Amino acid sequence: SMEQVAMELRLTELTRLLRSVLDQLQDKDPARIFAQPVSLKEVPDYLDHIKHPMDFATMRKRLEAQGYKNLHEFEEDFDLIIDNCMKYNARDTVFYRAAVRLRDQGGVVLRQARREVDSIG
Numbered sequence: 001s002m003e004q005v006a007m008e009l010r011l012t013e014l015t016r017l018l019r020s021v022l023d024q025l026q027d028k029d030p031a032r033i034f035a036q037p038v039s040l041k042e043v044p045d046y047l048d049h050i051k052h053p054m055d056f057a058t059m060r061k062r063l064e065a066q067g068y069k070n071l072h073e074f075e076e077d078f079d080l081i082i083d084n085c086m087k088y089n090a091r092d093t094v095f096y097r098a099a100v101r102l103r104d105q106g107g108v109v110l111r112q113a114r115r116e117v118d119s120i121g
Contacts, residue, residue: 028105033098054080
């Protein structure tokens with residue numbers, strides 16, 4: 001139908017805007033701490049600690065499959081990256097500190113993305 005097509009064009013454009021958001025967030029992680037899944041070869045007990053692992057490569061796969069229906073779903077995944085790290089790692093680690101900086105800097109990007117998604121519909 002024409003409506004399914006129009007809905008599909010909306011999802012495509014949301015995907016384009018979320019791709020730009022993802023790029024901006026990932027630039028706030030210049031050390032690439034959050035770029036890939038935590039390795040289960042190198043942290044074999046990780047899933048005993050963290051029940052829903054997340055990372056930027058995994059978000060990018062979901063994004064390119066148009067698997068984010070709205071900004072809320074995309075933010076959920078970004079928040080997992082941060083919140084998993086802040087639980088698994090102690091306060092005095094480069095990992096935790098990187099997550100806090102990513103959260104603080106990403107807030108700005110996500111604040112305007114919410115306005116853009118609301119604005120363009």
